[PDB]
Amino acid sequence: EEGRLLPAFSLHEVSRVLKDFLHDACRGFYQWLPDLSRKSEDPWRDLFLWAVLQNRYEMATYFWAMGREGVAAALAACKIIKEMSHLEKEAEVARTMREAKYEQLALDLFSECYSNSEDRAFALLVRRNHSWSRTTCLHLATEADAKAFFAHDGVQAFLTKIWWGDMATGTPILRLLGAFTCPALIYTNLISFSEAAFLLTRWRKFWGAPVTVFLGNVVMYFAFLFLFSYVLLVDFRPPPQGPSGSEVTLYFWVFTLVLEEIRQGFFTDTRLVKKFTLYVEDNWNKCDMVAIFLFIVGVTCRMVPSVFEAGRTVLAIDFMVFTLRLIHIFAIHKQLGPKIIIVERMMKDVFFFLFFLSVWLVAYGVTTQALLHPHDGRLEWIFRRVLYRPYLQIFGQIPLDEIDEARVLYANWLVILLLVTFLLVTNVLLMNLLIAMFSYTFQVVQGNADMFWKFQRYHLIVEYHGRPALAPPFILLSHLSLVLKQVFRPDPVDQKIITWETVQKENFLSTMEKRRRDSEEEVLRKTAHRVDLIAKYIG
């Protein structure tokens, strides 16, 4: 009905709703109508789609059992099933729709392929899939948000192997740090290296790894952070030219940084609105953008010498933001990652707890004010006292100074009782409500924690892999080279892989069936039927 502006709809509308579900995955399905008498190009896939759309599980499983390119289809089906759960009109059907469980079959099959010939499993995982409009498996895995699939051991092994590039090895951390510190030690055999121009290629293969680029970027970031702290500490001078030197240096640094950020956010694209949405998707980019906004406000400060102080405070806030951004490295470490994710998860309820505690604080302060003394000549001093008292509760200083003076004694005991009630109920709740959800996310959501950590690992890895192969200063030269290049401008092993995949799938299915066959309950059922038949035939 919307497009037009024995049922009427044809295969055109089916292709349209499919593209609506998956844009880059299956945009070209059923290329307006062709000749109906023509045979199908890939029958099993079409039947699989028709089955899974009508929410007919067993039919879909069977159709999948007779088709090629298994894991890709299994992930796409999970995507479509999870999609057709919010658009459901009946909650009864919505529950069973949300009970699809295709990702389980996908992971099971992929484990079966990974068990043997993992060297081919890795090729499959990045192989182009022919039926689904030339789309890689990881793209579908991402579009389906299949966190469970990433958590697979083979996926993590592939991530690790890509994390070290061609120079992969065991590579102890200290040995790597030393080899990076000693530019000549790399030519020696300090670590294993996989297979005038020779030394150039060797150094290229060295710096091309992701780990070394990550270390270099974190070193440069830490160094620039320290240097900016220095320039803000002592070089915050009047607007003569000399003081502005370090300032314009930091300005150029921030310019290169924001250029690299906008490149990583906008050229990593169908539409400009698509690039904007995907850039706004990440929260790290969000704090990056707010930090650049704060730095712009600081530049506006540097423009005007009359409001230099408030703008110095703005620069201080921007530095606080840049320092908060330094926690980005804690996710990569196996010991620090999950802890950081846990701390991130438990950040919601603590805010409301602080809100309630502050509300209670204020009521106590206002009450104490009436009982403290009659009126006040200056609001300021009262502001200082009434602010410091509840703020010092955590401190434990308990400066009942004014109260002692006031007694010189009926308002003291009420204050003591209220402070005791606070130091008990807050002390209790702040860990009681905390430990429950903490152990929850740690054990019952241990899977959630590990999965989120592995997901962030994959994201960081794929982000740093495409990182520019140059210094952030030289990144300008890289962009210029790209713009200049823009202005100036197999099959048989694939069939072997496909046959191997189908064979492994058939073997896995047969093994699952045979294992189900000899279960105890099936044995009792069969023996019961048999003894009943024997008893009937005998009499």
Question: Does 232 participate in binding a second copy (rule CB under 8 A)?
Answer: yes
Spatial separation of the C-alpha atoms in residues 496 and 163, rounded to whole Å: 28
Segment interacting with a second copy, rule: CB under 8 A, options 122-130, 179-187, 329-337, 469-477: 329-337
436 makes contact, choosing from Ca ion, a second copy, none, with CB < 5 to 8 Å by partner type, with a second copy
Nearest approach, Cβ of 105 to a second copy (angstroms)? 19
* Nearer CB in complex with Ca ion: 212/285: 285
Options 235, 261, 344, 494; binder of Ca ion; rule CB under 5 A: 261
Tokens 């093994």 locate to 511
Instruction: Give me the helix-helix angle, 153-163 and 446-465, nearest 10°.
Output: 30
* Tokens matching residue 220: 């440069």
Q: Is 539 in the site for a second copy (CB under 8 A)?
A: yes
Minimum distance between the CB of residue 268 and Ca ion, rounded to whole angstroms? 10
Distance in Å, CB of 296 to a second copy, minimum: 18
Q: How far apart are CA 479 and CA 474, in angstroms?
A: 9
Q: List Cα–Cα distances, 168 to 159, 205, 208, 452, in angstroms.
A: 12, 10, 11, 25
d(CA 186, CA 204) in angstroms, rounded, equals: 12
Asked if residue 260 binds Ca ion (CB under 5 A), the reply is no
Q: Is 195 in the site for a second copy (CB under 8 A)?
A: no
Least distance (Å) between residue 429 CB and a second copy: 6
CB contact at 8 A, 22 and 79: yes
| Region binding a second copy by CB under 8 A among candidate stretches 160-168, 194-202, 277-285, 320-328 | 320-328
352 binds a second copy (CB under 8 A): yes
Cβ closest to a second copy, residue 276 vs residue 293: 293
Q: Which does 288 bind (CB under 5 to 8 A by kind): a second copy, Ca ion, none?
A: Ca ion
- The least distance separating Ca ion from the CB of residue 53, rounded to whole angstroms, comes to 39
Closest by Cα among 267, 319, 197 to 479: 267
Of 304 and 435, CB closest to a second copy: 435
Return the number of the residue (36 or 87) whose C-beta is nearest a second copy. Answer: 87
Report how far residue 73's alpha carbon sits from residue 55's, in angstroms, rounded to the nearest whole number.
16
Counting contacts by CB under 8 A, is residue 139 touching a second copy? no
**Least distance in Å: CB of 282 to Ca ion?**
7
Interface residue with a second copy among 188, 335, 488, 489 (CB under 8 A) is 335
Q: What is the closest distance, in whole angstroms, from the C-beta atom of residue 216 to Ca ion in the complex?
A: 16
Find the binder of a second copy among 12, 128, 274, 348 (CB under 8 A). 348
Q: Does 371 help bind a second copy (rule: CB under 8 A)? A: yes
Site for a second copy in 236-295 (CB under 8 A): 236
SS3 content of the chain, % helix, strand, coil (to 5): 75, 0, 25
For residue 356, state whether it binds a second copy (rule: CB under 8 A).
Answer: yes
Binding to Ca ion, residues 275-314 (CB under 5 A):
285, 288
- Cα(157)–Cα(310) distance, integer angstroms: 51
Site for a second copy (CB under 8 A): which residue of 438, 455, 464, 474?
438
Closest residue by Cα to residue 330 from 346, 318, 320, 342: 342
Residue 219, interface with a second copy (CB under 8 A)? no
Out of 17, 126, 424, 483, which residue is the one contacting a second copy (CB under 8 A)? Answer: 424
With binding defined as CB under 8 A, does residue 416 bind a second copy? yes
DSSP state of 69: S
Q: What are phi and psi of 128, to 5 degrees?
A: -75, 135
| 3-state SS record for 116-183 | CCHHHHHHHHHCEECCCCCEEHHHHHHHCCCHHHHCCHHHHHHHHHHHCHHHCCCCCHHHHHHHHHCC
Instruction: Indicate whether 359 belongs to the interface with a second copy (CB under 8 A).
Output: yes
DSSP conformation class of 440: I
Residue 49, H or E segment? helix 43-53
DSSP string over 190-255: SS-----HHHHHHHHHHHTSHHHHHHHHHHHHHHHHHHHHHHHHT----SSHHHHHHHHHHHHHHH
Tell which positions 374-413 bind a second copy, by CB under 8 A.
Answer: 375, 380, 384, 387, 391-392, 394-398, 407, 409, 412-413
CA distances from 28 to 12, 24, 37, 80 (A): 11, 9, 20, 17
Stretch that binds Ca ion, among 12-20, 257-265, 409-417, 471-479 (CB under 5 A): 257-265
**Half-sphere exposure at residue 233, Cβ-oriented, CA atoms within 13 angstroms:** 6
Closer residue to a second copy (CB): 17 or 429: 429
Kindly tell me which of 69 and 318 has the beta carbon lying closer to a second copy: 318
Q: Is 522 in the site for a second copy (CB under 8 A)?
A: no
Provide the binding-site residues for Ca ion, judged by CB under 5 A: 261, 285, 288
